[PDB]
RNA sequence: UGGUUCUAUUUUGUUGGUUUCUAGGACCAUCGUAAUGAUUAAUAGGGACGGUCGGGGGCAUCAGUAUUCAAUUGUCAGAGGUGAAAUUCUUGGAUUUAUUGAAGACUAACUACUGCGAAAGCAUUUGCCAAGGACGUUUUCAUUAAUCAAGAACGAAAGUUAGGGGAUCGAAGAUGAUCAGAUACCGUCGUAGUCUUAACCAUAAACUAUGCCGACUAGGGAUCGGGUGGUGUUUUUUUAAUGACCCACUCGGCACCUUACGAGAAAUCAAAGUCUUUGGGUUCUGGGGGGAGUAUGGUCGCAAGGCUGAAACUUAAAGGA
RNA sequence: GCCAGCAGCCGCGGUAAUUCCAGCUCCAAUAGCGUAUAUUAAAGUUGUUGCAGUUAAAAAGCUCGUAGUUGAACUUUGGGCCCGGUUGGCCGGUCGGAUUUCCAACGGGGCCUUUCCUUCUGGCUAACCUUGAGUCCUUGUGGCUCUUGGCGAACCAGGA
């Protein structure tokens, strides 16, 4: 006689005692307050527009040393101030201050990647022309 | 035991086993036709009194009640039934 | 209490038989049960079984074979529609062939393969294998 | 297993099977009727009647010997009592306890037990609602028990 | 079969209104028609009964005994205390002894792989008070039951509120010791509290860190509670009677051993088994580590505090065997 | 020579650096490559199908409960006759498909065995229990032309 009511008329007490439970399970937490719209940068999104400030330097977390390349942004929305991260080379160079940049996630949700600490985004485009190209030289910049 | 007739076992195994399992339940207590010596009378008493009953009227005493079975006095034939 | 009957005795019958008891005794006797066994028996799963009355709700001996593999009571007693049993067999019968799921209609405190030849269905109490 | 403690008692009677007669007893059915109805006004309670009937005269249960069940009979004769007898010992216990709680407000065990007991009663009083044997509404009232018996 | 009651197509011009003709409603009695009509009674439940069982509860009595203290009673140097010490008591003759007393505190050994309770938790004795489990049951009612957001009892101790109690221990406070320091460990005293009445709080490693219902798998030998049987062991009294006992059996426990056919990260597990051959019933919970069960609001409390419960930021490990 | 610098993460670099700067050399995509962001699969790390909750992060302190959710079985089974579809064999019957006997599978309508088919007024009959006549041909339950008593659910259409 495990812990649940079982007979026939035990609809009522079931549609409640899952709907309570669900709570805790983290996911169903995000989706009811859902956080996504109020908290976090993109709100209910995937991508966005921003414009750079400084070119900050963030060393490592440690089993590592690794002085990586990050940029503060200004979005073109809530305004948060965010940092974000660059790929490939130096990549830095090609992000010349107060330029237009196109930001996206980091495929991890929330969370925070690899050897970087409070950091949660990547730089996809600039000006809107790739980075991918303004490192495999299929275009160049204005 | 891999097996057994539990229908009818021994008579043994019942006498000892508890009133309420001999299968079909049946009492142990039973009644007991008493000549106090004076009169011939015959009062139908029960093995477990709870009451002492008086004998018929002679005002006599008979059988005290205890845990289970009366203790009956000295005189009493106490033929069972 | 004892809140339900059929159950109680059944469980002891899958706890006699496991150990190799050749049989059983079970207390509260019903019609329900008498009928239940009378199905089981027809299908080759027990024998004889020697009601005993005592003017009471009564005791029933069930002589063994050592075939029984397993006869759980299901148990709200759900409802069921004809074409639905086709979900049950394969969620609690090893095969199909075989080994009867078992249910309660109107005739009938009678399995499903006989149910086809009748075309009837209601509520599903126990099941054998 | 007694509804109030940690206790799984077993002990009743192992009415015997025979429906009819004791046979060894050969006196009459009318005979014990008379006897009960003899007893009642005097000052009875059906519970006791049997005890007294059993220990002294032929009987074995009224039940064999007649086709009724004591009470039924008193009720025909009008001796049922205003109360269903088992109740009239519980309420009693109430008065008899509450009183004791009030000589010694510094007693808990007793307190609890009282409640417990208020409850035996409400439940048993809800039943002798239901089945037409307490004029509807009856409710039990703590304080009204002492001119209900003395 | 009346009656009753509604009508309102149809013809004695017809248009409308009495109201008689025929036809459809519907009903309470009524002679008649019927195998006249009510599922088992789940090894699901609830109940009654019967012997019972139990350190389950409360209210009262009852006894042990130590400790402390004081009297009485004696003798006469240190006693205490320790790893080793010193503070401490010592003609105001302690420490010891004798016996009686007083007080509040607890319930030794028995006492265990044992008892019962929903858990917390419960052991001197007896009397009321009502409760309850397990069996036994040719009693009963007949699907009433399983788990449960909401809601509502209980909840170790600590702690609080006001009275009572204030032996013993004994945070706090004071101390003497040790120690580079020692606000700690060691020693002696010590309010508060421990105890109880009445009211709060609701937390715990509240621990099997294992939700309950069920149903099925594989062997054992113990034990508590019942019950059944054996011209069973003693009791001896004359034979029985019971009773203890032995054994046989069982149902319900509280566990244990042994396997591993299974499961697992493993350690190990008769359940953590019947799960990629993936599904019997349902309630809670978690989704990297911290930040932090904090800040906030909202709420229960007199307060201590509880329940609710973020985010920014930071980080490549933290962890299990 | 732990400084420049690279490195999404593990990490190189503190005097011979397979990672930095650069030469040659090779590898991958290639008129197209990279780069950052968001989303997807990867994700059985949101899960109903498919998770985990003995100690990894998780079984509420324990019980009662109004909803919610599940809920033993039992109320025509069997047999009897039909008749036909269209897959599959056995003839291809023939200048690569047409169908019959032989004949397996398999559905499906009848009807009958005590057998509701809401059921009455017509019209409706559509079928044979009919049979007024009979016989092409294998010495006949193989083949369908015809009105008369009598089939109602092949169905119109008003109601109860």
């Amino acid at each position: 006689g495990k812990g649940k009511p079982r007979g026939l008329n035990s609809a009522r007490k079931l549609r409640v005692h899952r709907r309570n439970n669900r709570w805790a399970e983290n996911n169903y937490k995000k989706r009811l307050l859902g956080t996504a719209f109020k908290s976090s940068p993109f709100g209910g999104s995937s991508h966005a527009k921003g414009i750079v400030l400084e070119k900050l330097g963030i060393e490592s977390k440690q089993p590592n040393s690794a002085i990586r390349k990050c940029v503060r942004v200004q979005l073109i929305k809530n305004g948060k101030k965010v940092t974000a991260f660059v790929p490939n080379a130096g990549c830095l160079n090609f992000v010349d201050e107060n330029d237009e940049v196109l930001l996206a996630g980091f495929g991890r949700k929330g969370k925070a990647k690899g050897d970087i600490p409070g950091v949660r985004f990547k730089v996809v485009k600039v000006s809107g022309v790739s980075l991918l190209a303004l490192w495999k030289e299929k275009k160049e910049k204005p | 035991v891999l097996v057994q007739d539990l229908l009818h076992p021994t008579a043994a195994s019942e006498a000892r086993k508890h009133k309420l399992k001999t299968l079909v339940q049946g009492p142990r207590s039973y009644f007991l036709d008493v000549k106090c010596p004076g009169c011939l009378n015959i009062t139908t008493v029960f093995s477990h009194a709870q009451t002492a009953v008086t004998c018929e009227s002679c005002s006599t005493i008979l059988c005290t009640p205890t845990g289970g079975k009366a203790k009956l006095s000295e005189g009493t034939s106490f033929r069972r039934k | 209490t004892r809140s339900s009957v059929l159950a109680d005795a059944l469980n002891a019958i899958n706890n006699a038989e496991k150990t190799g008891k050749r049989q059983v005794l079970i207390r509260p006797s019903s019609k329900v049960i008498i009928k239940f066994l009378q199905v089981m028996q027809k299908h080759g799963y027990i024998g004889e079984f020697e009601y005993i009355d005592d003017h009471r709700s009564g005791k029933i001996v069930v002589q063994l074979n050592g075939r029984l593999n397993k006869c759980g009571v299901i148990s709200p007693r759900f409802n069921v529609k004809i074409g639905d049993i086709e979900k049950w067999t394969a969620n609690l019968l090893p095969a199909r062939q075989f080994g009867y799921v078992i249910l309660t209609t109107s005739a009938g405190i009678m399995d499903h393969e006989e149910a086809r030849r009748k075309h009837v269905s209601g509520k599903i109490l126990g099941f054998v294998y | 297993g007694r509804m109030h403690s940690a206790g799984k008692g077993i002990s009743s009677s192992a009415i015997p099977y025979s429906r009819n007669a004791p046979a060894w007893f050969k006196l009459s059915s009318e005979s014990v009727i008379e006897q009960i109805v003899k007893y009642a006004r005097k000052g009875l309670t059906p519970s006791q009647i049997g005890v007294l009937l059993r220990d002294a005269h032929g009987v074995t249960q009224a039940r064999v010997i007649t086709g009724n069940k004591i009470m039924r009979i008193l009720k025909s004769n009008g001796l049922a009592p205003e109360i269903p007898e088992d109740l009239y010992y519980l309420i009693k216990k109430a008065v008899s306890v509450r009183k004791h709680l009030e000589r010694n407000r510094k007693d808990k065990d007793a307190k609890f037990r009282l409640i417990l007991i208020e409850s035996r009663i409400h439940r048993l009083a809800r039943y002798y609602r239901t089945v037409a044997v307490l004029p509807p509404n009856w409710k039990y009232e703590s304080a009204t028990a002492s001119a209900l018996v003395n």
Side-chain angles (χ1 to χ4, degrees):
Chain A
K2 50 249 284 168
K4 45 195 179 84
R6 219 50 147 286
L8 185 279
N9 312 302
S10 307
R12 157 132 286 107
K13 170 60 189 307
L14 292 185
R15 197 179 69 267
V16 175
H17 170 69
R18 206 84 287 101
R19 206 185 71 202
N20 292 332
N21 273 359
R22 300 235 280 286
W23 307 94
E25 306 167 274
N26 180 119
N27 310 11
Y28 161 75
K29 176 49 60 166
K30 280 281 149 55
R31 203 168 61 263
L32 281 170
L33 291 65
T35 304
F37 298 78
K38 298 160 184 195
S39 168
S40 84
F42 297 109
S45 332
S46 306
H47 299 151
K49 214 153 278 193
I51 281 161
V52 173
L53 309 190
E54 53 189 324
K55 342 93 82 71
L56 221 158
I58 304 291
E59 43 189 324
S60 81
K61 276 158 68 170
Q62 261 280 39
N64 310 2
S65 302
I67 306 175
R68 324 214 86 89
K69 309 305 165 295
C70 314
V71 289
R72 311 202 86 150
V73 174
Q74 300 177 157
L75 293 151
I76 306 175
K77 171 140 70 164
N78 59 42
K80 52 195 180 193
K81 288 266 280 173
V82 187
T83 76
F85 169 77
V86 197
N88 291 148
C91 317
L92 219 189
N93 325 325
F94 312 156
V95 298
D96 298 338
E97 49 160 14
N98 322 294
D99 213 42
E100 195 186 53
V101 302
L102 191 286
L103 281 163
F106 212 164
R108 259 287 277 173
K109 301 140 148 280
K111 246 265 194 275
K113 183 280 228 298
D115 84 308
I116 312 179
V119 190
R120 297 170 284 190
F121 320 107
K122 55 210 266 188
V123 160
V124 166
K125 322 164 86 176
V126 306
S127 307
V129 300
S130 156
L131 205 294
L132 164 299
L134 196 68
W135 166 89
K136 298 209 280 201
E137 290 82 21
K138 295 169 183 292
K139 313 303 221 310
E140 226 233 358
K141 177 204 175 195
Chain B
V1 283
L2 267 274
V3 39
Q4 50 212 87
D5 269 358
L6 296 75
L7 43 69
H8 52 66
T10 45
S13 143
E14 284 38 51
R16 73 175 79 154
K17 194 196 287 79
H18 172 289
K19 73 208 289 248
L20 282 139
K21 284 179 175 165
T22 49
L23 206 53
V24 177
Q25 65 215 74
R28 268 68 213 287
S29 34
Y30 66 161
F31 315 81
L32 36 61
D33 314 49
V34 168
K35 308 166 218 78
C36 68
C39 276
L40 14 157
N41 50 24
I42 347 179
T43 35
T44 300
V45 192
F46 177 50
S47 285
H48 294 64
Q50 311 172 16
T51 19
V53 178
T54 49
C55 175
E56 76 74 19
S57 38
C58 43
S59 186
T60 49
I61 188 48
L62 268 165
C63 45
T64 181
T66 87
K69 299 195 184 213
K71 188 205 301 192
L72 50 78
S73 167
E74 278 82 349
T76 157
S77 56
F78 107 91
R79 185 197 66 164
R80 174 234 47 194
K81 279 235 176 79
Chain C
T1 66
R2 183 239 295 280
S3 301
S4 172
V5 168
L6 209 175
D8 192 310
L10 253 172
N11 135 287
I13 316 196
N14 294 126
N15 202 48
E17 176 268 18
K18 283 174 178 297
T19 66
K21 259 78 184 60
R22 212 55 160 79
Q23 45 35 87
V24 198
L25 202 152
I26 70 189
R27 193 100 76 76
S29 61
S30 84
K31 286 71 56 170
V32 167
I33 294 166
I34 307 300
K35 314 130 88 285
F36 196 78
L37 288 317
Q38 222 165 150
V39 161
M40 262 216 282
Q41 192 156 16
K42 186 143 81 270
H43 325 111
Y45 275 70
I46 37 65
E48 88 184 325
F49 62 84
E50 229 182 40
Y51 204 104
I52 178 164
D53 195 49
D54 71 342
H55 316 240
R56 214 104 52 178
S57 322
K59 306 183 183 192
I60 296 158
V61 166
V62 175
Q63 295 280 162
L64 5 111
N65 34 52
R67 288 210 221 282
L68 220 82
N69 277 255
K70 174 182 171 189
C71 50
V73 65
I74 178 48
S75 151
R77 308 252 187 73
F78 290 127
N79 295 132
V80 192
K81 331 274 193 185
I82 214 50
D84 307 11
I85 51 95
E86 231 92 294
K87 226 159 301 204
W88 283 80
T89 59
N91 156 50
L92 40 153
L93 300 171
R96 300 183 55 226
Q97 336 299 65
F98 51 111
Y100 322 95
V101 159
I102 189 276
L103 76 171
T104 306
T105 57
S106 45
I109 319 174
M110 39 142 277
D111 104 74
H112 53 283
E113 298 171 7
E114 208 164 301
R116 262 45 206 72
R117 288 176 270 118
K118 334 152 187 175
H119 199 279
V120 65
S121 171
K123 291 153 158 57
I124 183 166
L125 30 75
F127 59 88
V128 170
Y129 25 103
Chain D
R2 253 104 309 268
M3 75 131 105
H4 282 159
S5 57
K8 273 58 59 168
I10 103 176
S11 164
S12 79
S13 284
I15 194 163
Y17 192 76
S18 187
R19 302 199 207 99
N20 73 324
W24 70 265
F25 159 98
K26 79 292 107 196
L27 311 167
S28 31
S29 295
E30 165 227 325
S31 71
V32 301
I33 296 183
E34 182 177 322
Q35 274 265 29
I36 298 154
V37 198
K38 175 71 267 298
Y39 290 121
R41 296 86 208 154
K42 195 161 148 277
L44 281 305
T45 17
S47 290
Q48 296 175 329
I49 239 68
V51 163
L52 206 75
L53 256 199
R54 204 222 310 106
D55 84 58
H57 324 311
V59 311
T60 42
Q61 54 177 346
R63 172 265 170 76
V64 185
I65 237 73
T66 59
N68 326 87
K69 201 181 206 79
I70 301 97
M71 256 294 294
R72 284 298 202 79
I73 304 202
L74 261 66
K75 137 53 251 152
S76 331
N77 300 19
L79 254 285
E82 56 282 328
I83 46 196
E85 60 173 353
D86 62 335
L87 208 176
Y88 174 56
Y89 290 120
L90 293 164
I91 341 176
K92 214 144 162 280
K93 227 152 194 172
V95 161
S96 221
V97 175
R98 191 185 309 283
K99 191 191 185 189
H100 152 56
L101 189 278
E102 312 281 13
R103 276 170 225 143
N104 59 209
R105 292 130 275 273
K106 198 67 172 306
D107 201 326
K108 338 308 278 264
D109 175 24
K111 170 167 123 206
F112 202 100
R113 281 313 206 289
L114 186 285
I115 292 186
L116 287 71
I117 254 190
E118 311 178 345
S119 60
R120 245 175 292 177
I121 317 147
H122 273 76
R123 306 168 71 160
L124 233 205
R126 211 201 335 93
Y127 169 87
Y128 283 104
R129 277 141 295 106
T130 329
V131 303
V133 72
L134 255 180
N137 88 71
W138 176 96
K139 165 144 50 257
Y140 164 73
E141 36 280 312
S142 299
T144 78
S146 181
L148 170 152
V149 28
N150 290 306

